[PDB]
Structure formats: structure tokens, C-alpha cells
Amino acid sequence: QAENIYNRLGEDLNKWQALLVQIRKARGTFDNAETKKEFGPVVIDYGK
């Protein structure tokens, strides 16, 4: 819920900075060069 997220954020500069940092880390995590992650002897990864 975008409105709920914005309301939870409020207008704190520190809150905005922290949200930006967390968003950057998360956008780093999901999505990468490879397609299917092979983490383990049996690997299930989702290109779609």
C-alpha cells in the first residue's frame, strides 16, 4: 500500500535516507547477472 508506506515514512530526513539505503540494498539482492541461482546440490531458480 503506497499511501500507507508514505504515511509510515512521514517526513523525516533520516527516515528517507534509511529507506533509500534499504531500497538500494534490496534492489541489489533480487536480480543479478545469472538466471537461476544454484545454491546447493539441488538448485531451483526463477528466471520468469
Binding site: 534492489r27 541489489g28 536480480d31 543479478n32 547477472a33
Partner: peptide
């Protein structure tokens, strides 16, 4: 050998080979 390598880029002459190249894409950010 230098002439042959130049041609390959393009018997005592020789004929070397070539490797691959760094070609790819990303959307990281």
C-alpha cells in the same frame, strides 16, 4: 608470424588462434 597473426586478426608462416571477448549486459541499478 607477425603478418600471419595480423591476417588471423583480419609451412613456415604459422597460424595462431584467438580467444573470446568480454561482451555482456546488465541493469544493475
Amino acid at each position: 608470424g607477425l603478418r600471419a597473426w595480423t591476417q588471423v586478426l583480419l609451412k613456415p608462416g604459422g597460424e595462431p588462434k584467438i580467444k573470446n571477448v568480454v561482451h555482456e549486459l546488465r541493469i544493475t541499478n
